[PDB]
Amino acid sequence: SHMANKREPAPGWPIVSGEYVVGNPESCVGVVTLGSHGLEQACIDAGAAIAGPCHTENLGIEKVVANYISNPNIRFMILCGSEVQGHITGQCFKALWENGIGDDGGIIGAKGAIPFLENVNKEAVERFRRQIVEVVDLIDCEDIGKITQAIKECLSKDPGAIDEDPFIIELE
């Protein structure tokens, strides 16, 4: 029963190049599709701000964190698609949000092979953790019908942008 407040993303958003499709930049929902193919367009059509795969539990996670915190409008992350064996990227991303990172850049509680953030610092991680108000765990789910329902549920709960400027973290 509300009109959610909105902010301008960083100029050029998404600034970090990668494998994703861009949607409505004022959408409050981002979607990570892990190891699956073919889910991205449907997520954008459902209303996502951005949707794309995430293969590695280091660089992959950094590019997602960097492109979400440069857009204050994004308040939800949906994790869906097949888990990556060895990388276990979905579990690593959940652990980042739940626990943060160590002094060494290691994701606390992560089960993947190389869960280290070399470029994304403690301040950027804490911005990610207060900007994203909820992580929706649909890990290993490839039902586009369920995933789109999750997207619309988030959109109906839009709490508006975080009241901070875009956060710019430089990657490699």
Residue numbers in the entry: -1 to 170
Give the article text.
In the methanogenic pathway from H2 and CO2, the membrane-spanning methyl-tetrahydromethanopterin (CH3-H4MPT):coenzyme M (CoM-SH) methyltransferase complex (MtrA–H) catalyses the exergonic methyl transfer from CH3-H4MPT to CoM-SH (ΔG°′ = −30 kJ/mol) coupled with endergonic sodium-ion gradient formation. The only prosthetic group required for catalysis is vitamin B12 (cobalamin) bound to MtrA. Here, we report on the X-ray structures of the B12-binding domain of membrane-associated MtrA from Methanocaldococcus jannaschii and of the MtrA homologue from M. fervidus in complex with cobalamin. Analyses of these structures reveal a cobalamin-binding site that differs from other B12-binding proteins in an unexpected manner and also provides initial hints of how the energy of cobalt demethylation is transformed into conformational energy used for the ultimate sodium-ion translocation process.
Primary structure analysis predicts MtrC, MtrD and MtrE as integral membrane proteins with at least six transmembrane helices, MtrA, MtrB, MtrF and MtrG as peripheral proteins with one transmembrane helix anchor, and MtrH as a peripheral protein without a membrane anchor. Membrane-associated MtrA devoid of the C-terminal transmembrane helix was over-produced in Escherichia coli 20 years ago in a soluble but cobalamin-free form, and the holoenzyme was reconstituted by unfolding and refolding in the presence of cobalamin11. However, cobalamin appears to bind less tightly to isolated MtrA than to MtrA in the MtrA–H complex. The structure of cytoplasmic MtrA complexed with cobalamin and the structure of the soluble domain of MtrA without cobalamin were essentially identical. This finding suggested that the MtrA structures observed in this work were relaxed forms.
